[PDB]
Amino acid sequence: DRFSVNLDVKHFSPEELKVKVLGDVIEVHGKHEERQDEHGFISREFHRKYRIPADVDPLTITSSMSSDGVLTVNGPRK
Amino acid sequence: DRFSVNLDVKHFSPEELKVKVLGDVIEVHGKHEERQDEHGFISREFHRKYRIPADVDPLTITSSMSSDGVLTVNGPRK
Numbered sequence A, B: 001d002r003f004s005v006n007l008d009v010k011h012f013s014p015e016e017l018k019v020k021v022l023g024d025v026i027e028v029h030g031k032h033e034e035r036q037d038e039h040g041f042i043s044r045e046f047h048r049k050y051r052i053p054a055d056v057d058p059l060t061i062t063s064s065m066s067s068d069g070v071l072t073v074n075g076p077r078k
Helices: none
Strands: A003-008 A017-022 A025-036 A041-051 A062-066 A070-075 B003-008 B017-022 B025-036 B041-051 B062-066 B070-075
Touching (some): B017 B070, B025 B070
Antiparallel strands (some): A003 A070, A025 A041, B003 B070, B062 B070
16 A cells, blocks of 8 residues: 555666656656667666656655666655 | 565665675675765775575575665565
């Protein structure tokens, strides 16, 4: 029992991600500079927005990141 | 129902922390270079070791970090 959304961000280090709560919107921004991988070189950037449900206080929204590279944003329901 | 230890690492960015599982030991290493804060300048380093309980498979150990600056290391019991 709680609001929760998950996002696969394994291509981004925690420092390349920012989570912000603006009004009743959760904003997740990810950006990394050109980086070498198995296939060549790559840079990535995304901006994701979630609507916070009415029964969830935006002030109580927190987040966590797993060693899996999964970002979780969650909050208690009121 | 699950093995879990928490560690307050709010003074360290995720990239300044490393979690390693060696045998049945969880190793958490934190280190940050000299950094300005409210009181002056500070560098910190710690090395913490936890014993993994017998009924916990070390291979299934994962971790996560909260926006609170709390590091959690956890694993299912077998």
